[model samples]
Target: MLLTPEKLLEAANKQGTVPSRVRYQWMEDEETGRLKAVGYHTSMESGRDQVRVRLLKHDFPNNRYEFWEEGATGPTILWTPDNPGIELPTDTAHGEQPVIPSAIPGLEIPEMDDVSILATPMPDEKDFRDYILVFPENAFPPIYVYLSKL
Candidate 1:
């Protein structure tokens, strides 16, 4: 199933005992070829409708990726909760890109043509947190650091 902001909010607030903290990452899904925020929550926030989450894209070893289609010049793929399927236009004309939330202050985000969302269970909390939040690639001045530590 495709992921949506409402589903993401549900994931963030779903827990038998407590409100779970949903970890979000900005990355590209190789299988689906959709650039979006993939979120994950573990059994664990508040009056706020949204919360800050660390972005793993800034810390990834590679900072950029390109999605291409054979015999299709500069094909763009668009995915959303309503329209999860990929779209390819033969002409250069296309609709506007998705509007990402301005949750992060002082950070200017570039335009995104398409986006998607998905969540899954935490197989290993330790490895999962580290993999999502901490890594050697972020050895230098951390730009995407978070407040809490697990």
Candidate 2:
């Protein structure tokens, strides 16, 4: 079936947790040439200046996220970061500022680029899920950001 918010929520629910927000963009496999839905979500936890975020790739034939980063903290399937909190933004928040705009290229809303990234720096570590593509930030409600093309 095609990817939709309901199915995405159901898939996340199947893992036994709910998310504040969900979103995805379309893409095709390189070799296999398969159609898939790739997206992200955040934990219900939206306080403490941080929240959990993750990405997954699937076709939704079953209630499962077929692809995810290995060695993650929790549930490896739904992509929960229980141990380390996904960082958020604040004008007054200090000690590890939010991500810097110059670090990101071709940003659509250029003015949105203000703070510099700290806890989860979207640097050269492409091994993690969607590291090279997006950065997930949340403040009570979550944000899933797809970056400028590399």
Candidate 3:
């Protein structure tokens, strides 16, 4: 099914917890010329920082560098001195400070470049459900599951 604001809300509400997953697919930000993910998340705890969800198969160094280094992705909220945050210009209300972009220079990361991901609803209702969260509409691209007639 095509993704809509209402569907995204429904999907988030139904699961009670929403996981923002990012694939290589990028949408050109009309305002910033920055390639942004339609599939991403904002942290509620630390005032909503944009975050990218990655597949388990994609190892560190590579995907990590792309996200942490390339100035492509970063944390939405809940950041600490150790847990540094990245800057995403898309979410203006939340993009507090744009940190200097940097990534691990060289590392071997997995290649889940074009694979599709499936996310189940979050069961922990109390933690984040009480709060309303908005994300990059394109952050988490939608994939329809086809069922053949039996």
Candidate 4:
């Protein structure tokens, strides 16, 4: 489902013990094949919606990654309760990229044209949090999936 701030919160706030992970898609411009940075989410913990997203610029391939796909790729993780109030080295690469609130262990893998949302236990210290893992469709030696979509 296309996630919005309201829908995200609504889905997250649902009463349930098991966490839910939904998928989203990332794509380069079909024509120009340009990488875009999609971010700007509302933080349930900070009680504010001013988080800016991070993207890897073409020239910053070293900082980003081009896994599977010839073009660069990165993760699109939504906020997780385990996040907020934590400071970690942010990596915008592509597999097993350490994410906030961590991942679903066996679920972290390379994805193409698809993103996901994981409904996990809200960080006890915070209000709510979610996560998304991303990847390219065609590259040797996969890239690590980092956190994005803040």
TM-score for each predicted model, relative to the true structure = 0.21, 0.19, 0.18, 0.19
> Where does model 2 exceed 4 Å of error?
16-126, 131-150
Q: Candidate 3 residues 12-93, lDDT tens each?
A: 4444322222212233456986643222222345332222222111123433211121242553222222434332324422
The TM-score leader among the candidates is: 1
Residue 91 lDDT in candidate 1: 27
Candidate 3: clashing residue pairs, number: 14
Model 1: per-residue Cα lDDT over 63-137, one tens digit each: 321223225365233222243322333322222222133233212122222433244544343222111111123
**Per-residue lDDT for 40-146 in model 2, tens only?**
33222432212123334432454333224346343322322433233222221111112222222112112223332233322232321222112222211222333
Q: Would you list the C-alpha lDDT of every candidate in the order shown?
A: 0.28, 0.28, 0.27, 0.28
* Residue range with the least summed lDDT across 10 consecutive positions in model 4: 50-59
Judged by TM-score relative to the true structure, which candidate is superior, 1 or 2? 1
Model 4 over residues 72-132: C-alpha lDDT tens digits?
Answer: 2533232222332212234432223222223342222223333433343322222222232
Off by over 4 Å in 1: 1-20, 31-33, 44-119, 123-150
